[PDB]
């Protein structure tokens with residue numbers, strides 16, 4: 392019953408989203424988070440470098456999430472970011488934090504950024520770590536940021 | 540609004556408590572967790588090693604006419620000598636109260652955690668607030684809970700990342 396990090400990431404963003412909010416999905420990929428966010432927000436901007444439900448309130452952008460300041464102009468209520476690469480960003484996060492409205496939230500799922508969020512001024516941002524401690528395979532963890 | 544670890548601890552425990560439940564306050568202190576627990580649980584066992592803790596907590600129980608709490612002047616490591624029933628929820632608040640210096644200690648802390656985890660009901664929860672020889676206890680608790688078998692326990696860390704002066708953090712444990 393304890394929430395997995397991925398579940399809390401959704402809850403965290405959902406708690407502040409409404410049909411007046413703009414949301415960002417900085418790491419589109421499969422589109423699962425885009426869909427989740429589209430149902431809760433006025434509009435969603437989604438980004439990926441890689442090129443049905445009649446949604447229509449979503450804009451897909453193909454060009455570095457770090458190019459946010461060139462695509463979205465309005466204040467942002469909620470944003471989700473994925474971090475970490477499978478065996479085979481910092482300016483983006485910074486720009487999102489700047490654009491977040493008061494009470495706005497950024498969720499970073501992690502599968503230099505840590506060093507950066509740790510450095511944020513506690514009077515202007517609350518940054519919390521939510522991390523499984525006893526999982527045998529190294530699981531994803533969540534960094535929750537709320538703009539004060 | 541984003542919860543402080545202390546606020547999440549209360550939420551985490553209240554979610555599984557009811558008037559059939561036995562609850563443990565392993566570190567009575569001034570009694571604030573004991574009083575909270577007594578409102579939700581069938582019965583509360585609260586432990587401290589300082590007489591002052593029982594005096595202060597007793598005063599709160601009297602004011603509120605609380606009848607379902609047993610105060611115990613003995614280490615939380617002795618819990619099995621006092622508590623026979625399965626436990627639904629438990630809390631620790633580590634590292635000293637404003638009254639001199641009788642801090643919680645690694646061995647006694649871990650012994651109490653182990654016994655409480657053995658006694659928890661399936662679905663039961665243990666909340667540990669870690670204040671930080673602050674660091675030796677911190678490390679010992681982290682090292683202990685990390686080795687809990689994932690098939691039997693889910694262990695989550697809830698910790699502030701951008702605050703100065705080493706703020707306390709929460710370890711949440713749920714028995715599977």
Ligand SMILES: Nc1ncnc2c1ncn2[C@@H]1O[C@H](CSCC[C@H](N)C(=O)O)[C@@H](O)[C@H]1O
Nearest residue numbers: 566568587588614615632634635636643670
């Ligand atoms: N072995 C033990 N068993 C039970 N209680 C203990 C103990 N060792 C220390 N304690 C008690 O644990 C309590 C910790 S209260 C500290 C809470 C936290 N630092 C805060 O600021 O709120 C103290 O009352 C102390 O007397």
